[PDB]
């Protein structure tokens, strides 16, 4: 049972559109479903789709495969689970975004990891995410034979979504309801959702604005010496004390935000403190799996060679 296998290996449930889209791709190319969109869109299905693909099967147990790292790009936060890849020149990729390991994805996000850390919303299911990508591709293609192929995939995609009841919109009602719960955008822009009660307990803002925090981070990276770097780091050390205060007052979202911003900034100079902030924040929020993902990822934060099944 590949479905049980994929959810066991990632320790995450997958939504029904994940499995329906596999079937859709099997229909497009029965022999190599994960590559059904490679020629027309330049996209390949990977990650949990590798499991559906049976790519993991040839290896003999114990393989040592770690799904926490599998197709995890450099700026993928633990919430983001890659399912589609494009060109490695930009490291374009799409992933399911989950606010909690115990909840189904709230949308499909996209990022170009060689460009920046920003995660853009691209529909709430993979049919929508591919439809929206295809629509953009339609504006760039200059060969009527290739346009014909894209129109055919578009027609099949739209009909499948209609029968299954999936919205093709970039932002759905459900996504707008989730974004109401966002307490801060973070550096990746995709939003952080943590519980906030009636008395406002659960989150507090960082004592620096995002722009000033980036200024501080840049000073750490640009520092000419260890002593210079220590002085530049001082505001971040102070913010970690403020996070300790917040944790004592149950405002666990603050440490998640600081840790996420530091991770998003991308410098290895922040891996130690990110490894203090983020596992603790996720564990306090009872999002235990995400603490394990960030521990694994910070220890092996690869720019290239993230395919555990290469």
Numbering used by the authors: 36 to 345
From the study:
A previously uncharacterized protein, C4orf27, was demonstrated to be a cofactor of PARP1. It has been well established that HPF1 binding to PARP1 restricts hyper-automodification of PARP123,26.
We also determined structures of human and mouse HPF1 alone, and observed that the conformation does not change upon binding to PARP1.
